């Protein structure tokens, strides 16, 4: 009702995640938005938002962003709140590791969305990240391929964080 999630997934861990963000925040505040379904539009209608886009590819954005990615100098982000989570595996893609949020906020950012939820790059092991705005990631980092047993935990303390910055 008042929180627009969208993600796009590669082989479904980024939805299940999504699933696990609604339930965390509750009183159905978040409403679930696949990006492959999409329009760029539907962004606009929310006020705060939470970015979600896993990083498989070494130079290239997850084909549902991707098409949208295109298409967001369309929307005016001036007052919005944006939150950003990504999955990827920084030992196979360590000088990319979650490239795809670092993209994403740094194109949504310039627009005028303001970020939270900043996230620390400790308890990682990796090389280079566009998401890395030093010291933290632009947002929730997950590892399902070398780090599954990690993600309850990191989702419920973002989540704990996402609560009080956007004023829940």
Not at 2 to 17: D, H, N, P, R
Not at 79 to 93: E, M, S
Request: include cysteine; charge should be negative.
């Amino acid at each position: 009702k008042k929180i627009g999630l969208f993600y796009g997934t590669q082989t479904g861990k980024t939805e299940s995640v999504a699933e696990i963000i609604r339930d965390e925040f509750g009183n159905d505040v978040v409403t679930l938005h696949d990006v492959s379904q999409a329009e760029v539009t539907d962004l606009n209608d929310y006020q705060y938002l939470i970015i979600g886009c896993p990083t498989w590819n070494i130079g290239e954005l997850q084909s549902d962003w991707e098409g949208l990615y295109s298409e967001l100098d369309d929307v005016d982000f001036n007052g919005k709140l944006v939150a950003y989570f990504g999955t990827g595996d920084q030992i196979g893609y360590a000088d990319n590791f979650q490239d795809a949020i670092g993209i994403l906020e740094e194109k949504i950012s310039q627009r005028g969305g303001k970020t939270v939820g900043y996230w620390s790059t400790d308890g990682y092991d990796f090389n280079d990240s566009k998401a890395l705005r030093n010291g933290k990631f632009v947002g929730l980092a997950l590892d399902e391929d070398n780090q599954s047993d990690l993600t309850d935990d990191r989702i419920k303390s973002w989540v704990a964080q996402l609560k009080s910055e956007f004023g829940l």
